[PDB]
Design a protein that fits this description.
This is part of a larger assembly, with two copies of chain A, two copies of chain B and one copy of chain C.
Chain A (H helix, E strand, L loop, with lengths): L2 H25 L17 H11 L12 H17 L9 H5 L3 H15 L1
Helix pairs in contact in A: 1-5, 2-3
Chain B lengths: L4 H4 L23
Chain C lengths: L6 E5 L3 E5 L8 E4 L2 E4 L14 E2 L1 H5 L4 E4 L2 E2 L2 E2 L2 H15 L9 E5 L6 H12 L5 E6 H9 L4 E6 L4 E7 L2 E2 L5 E3 L3 H12 L9 H13 L7 H10 L6 E3 L5 E3 L24 H10 L6 H5 L2 E4 L8 H12 L8 E2 L7 H9 L10 E2 H7 L4 H4 L2
Parallel strand pairs in C: 1-9, 9-10, 11-17, 17-18
Antiparallel strand pairs in C: 1-2, 2-3, 4-5, 4-6, 7-8, 10-19, 11-12, 12-13, 12-14, 15-16
Classes of the chains: A mainly alpha, B little secondary structure, C alpha+beta.
The structure holds adenosine-5'-diphosphate.
The site of adenosine-5'-diphosphate has 17 residues of chain C, from α6.
PDB class: membrane protein
Keywords: Macrocomplex, membrane protein
Entry title: Structure of mammalian spectrin-actin junctional complex of membrane skeleton, State II, Global map
């Protein structure tokens, strides 16, 4: 059953709850919350307003699009905002967030937590 | 470092390698 | 207000379609024809019109010679293009051209002076603040909604294939076959001469094109279809000419588009469209062929013959290895796909930085398009 | 009066609301 | 019955109403008010009056007659006056105005508005 990924999976099954409970407190100032860390992060609006709450400076207007390309736009805007504020991210792309990769999303959230506070 | 660093990032407090007697006959995939 | 709507004009050899950026459908669709009167007018005071542009030229086909400004995707006559663009801007959309950016589409492989001439005409005459040029089959992938696949565009001018994997386009795998709809119209005239019907004038070419659009289909098995059509008369249809004469198309209905798959009927030794698509797939790398097989996208009006999707899928499955997935994606509105995805390209926020500004054109001249587009 | 009032430029964008632009039916098409 | 034509005539109605109000604003001086743009321009006399009140210059007097040829002549005189006033009209014919095509009449009105400022 591949003990390596078993130990990994027991790590992120707790790591997910920790990050979700942390992010819900900051997102509660706005009338928004996320039930799943991977699926609502695909749209890109939730992380944009999370950066709204944390940074205190406004971001450009999100695109009102249901397409995959509009989701790539919405994630790319927030990633450019993160790159604006000295934050270093490795192999972090908008298509990785849209495709819902587990460990890259978790690393992005962990990097945000480490950088901001 | 909200809630402490150790609580925020799940660090394994126990050590599994100390319990196992001998690592030579150790299998990762049963297969 | 700010961020004013930028209009998009798709010009092909057959029809021109113009519309605003935000709309899902073009406002104006009209054929690209410029007609001029043959005969000498005899009534004094009737009024003088030197040239006819657009739908009323199709209305008055009897007393005019129909001509096409575009042949094989290359603009042969530029004054006719100025007439077409003026009629588009001021009569069909009736908007000021100097206050909106313009998006234009073109074929992948073409003479390099065509882009420069479009840029020079768009800036010097119409005084547009910005303009951009894009490849049609790339915009078809925007209309598809996926960032991975191979686009096969077949229009009135040319047929071109391009693969795009993960937003990256491979330029060496692009192929441009010269088979198109006008060649099929000419072949339909040539095979309609077998039954005794003769069409020679330019006005009757439109009638033959309408016959092709209404009574043609692609046979799944061509030689079986030949046997079936020779055995009985069940595969027959009747068409009515504008003067009331009735003709029977009969056998020829599946013989006109079959030339798309076997070009040797026209005397050309080039491969068929299915082999062109397979060769464009095979020129790519080993790892990305699996995703390209399962995301083949059909586009262009010429691909609206009924049964072309099943035939193309069967031929590609025969060419491809047996263990893979081959599926052909055919939108029901694919004739406008080149327009539709283009509108999406004008809606994105990051696209505002790569408009060709008037100041950049003034500084660099008409060659700047080769640096700015594609 | 101005350009913007004279020409009815649509403020609303219909393409943004549609989730699947692939699945459009302009005409039943038979 | 189709999306393209629905969008097109949805634009035509608004632009027709605006053009009718503008033409009536400039035609309020002379005792002529047009109820429908397509029906009243078919004769061609009010369009001549509109041109010679906009330009403030004399135009040749209209030919008197009920027949179609007289209407074609009356439209052609105004088109020729616009043509010698340096204004480029594309796909403009007198018989198009007489037959009452919507797009061509609206385009002629739009060209007159944009060129006579
Ligand atoms: N319903 C139809 N069925 C089959 N062929 C069609 C149909 N409609 C158009 N065509 C063919 O497609 C051509 C028009 O292609 P089009 O999509 O206008 O190319 P472009 O837009 O690049 O000019 C016409 O010449 C005609 O032969």
């Amino acid at each position: 059953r591949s003990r390596i990924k078993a130990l990994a999976d027991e790590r992120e099954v707790v790591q997910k709850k920790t990050f979700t409970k942390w992010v819900n407190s900051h997102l509660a100032r706005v009338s928004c919350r996320i039930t799943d860390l991977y699926k609502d992060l695909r749209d890109g609006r939730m992380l944009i307003k999370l950066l709204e709450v944390l940074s205190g400076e406004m971001l450009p207007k999100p695109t009102k699009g249901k397409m995959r390309i509009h989701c790539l736009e919405n994630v790319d805007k927030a990633l450019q905002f993160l790159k604006e504020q000295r934050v270093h991210l490795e192999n972090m792309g908008s298509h990785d967030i849209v495709d819902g990769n587990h460990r890259l999303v978790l690393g992005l959230i962990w990097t945000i937590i480490l950088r901001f506070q | 470092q909200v809630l402490g660093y150790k609580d925020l990032a799940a660090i394994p407090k126990d050590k599994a390698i100390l319990d196992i007697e001998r690592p030579d006959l150790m299998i990762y995939e049963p297969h | 207000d700010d961020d004013i709507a930028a209009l998009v004009v798709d010009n092909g050899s057959g029809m021109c379609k113009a519309g605003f950026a935000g709309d899902d459908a073009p406002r104006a669709v009209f054929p690209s024809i410029v007609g001029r009167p043959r005969h000498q007018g005899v009534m004094v005071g009737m009024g003088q019109k030197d040239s006819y542009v657009g739908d009323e030229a199709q209305s008055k086909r009897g007393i005019l010679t129909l001509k096409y400004p575009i042949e094989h995707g290359i603009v042969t006559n530029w004054d006719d293009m100025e007439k077409i663009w003026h009629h588009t801007f001021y009569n069909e959309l009736r908007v000021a051209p100097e206050e909106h950016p313009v998006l234009l589409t073109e074929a992948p492989l073409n003479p390099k002076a065509n882009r420069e001439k479009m840029t020079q005409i768009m800036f010097e005459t119409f005084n547009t603040p910005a303009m951009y040029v894009a490849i049609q089959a790339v915009l078809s992938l925007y209309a598809s909604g996926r960032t991975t696949g191979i686009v096969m565009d077949s229009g009135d001018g040319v047929t071109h294939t391009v693969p795009i994997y993960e937003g990256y386009a491979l330029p060496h795998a692009i192929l441009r076959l010269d088979l198109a709809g006008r060649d099929l119209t000419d072949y339909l005239m040539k095979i309609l001469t077998e039954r005794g019907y003769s069409f020679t004038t330019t006005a009757e070419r439109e009638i033959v094109r309408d016959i092709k659009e209404k009574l043609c289909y692609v046979a799944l098995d061509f030689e079986q279809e030949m046997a079936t059509a020779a055995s009985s008369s069940s595969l027959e249809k009747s068409y009515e000419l504008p003067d009331g004469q009735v003709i029977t198309i009969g056998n020829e209905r599946f013989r006109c588009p079959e030339a798309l798959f076997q070009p040797s009927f026209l005397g050309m030794e080039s491969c068929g469209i299915h082999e062109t698509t397979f060769n464009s797939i095979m020129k790519c790398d080993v790892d990305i062929r699996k995703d390209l097989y399962a995301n083949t996208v059909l586009s262009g009006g010429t691909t609206m013959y009924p049964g072309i999707a099943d035939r193309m899928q069967k031929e590609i499955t025969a060419l491809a290895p047996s263990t893979m997935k081959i599926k052909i994606i055919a939108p029901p509105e694919r004739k406008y796909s080149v327009w539709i995805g283009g509108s999406i390209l004008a809606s994105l926020s990051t696209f505002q930085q790569m408009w060709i500004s008037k100041q950049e054109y003034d500084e660099s001249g008409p060659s700047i398009v080769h640096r700015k587009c594609f | 009066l101005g350009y913007k009032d004279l020409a009815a430029i649509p403020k609303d964008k219909a393409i943004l609301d549609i989730e699947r632009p692939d699945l459009m039916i302009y005409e039943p098409h038979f």
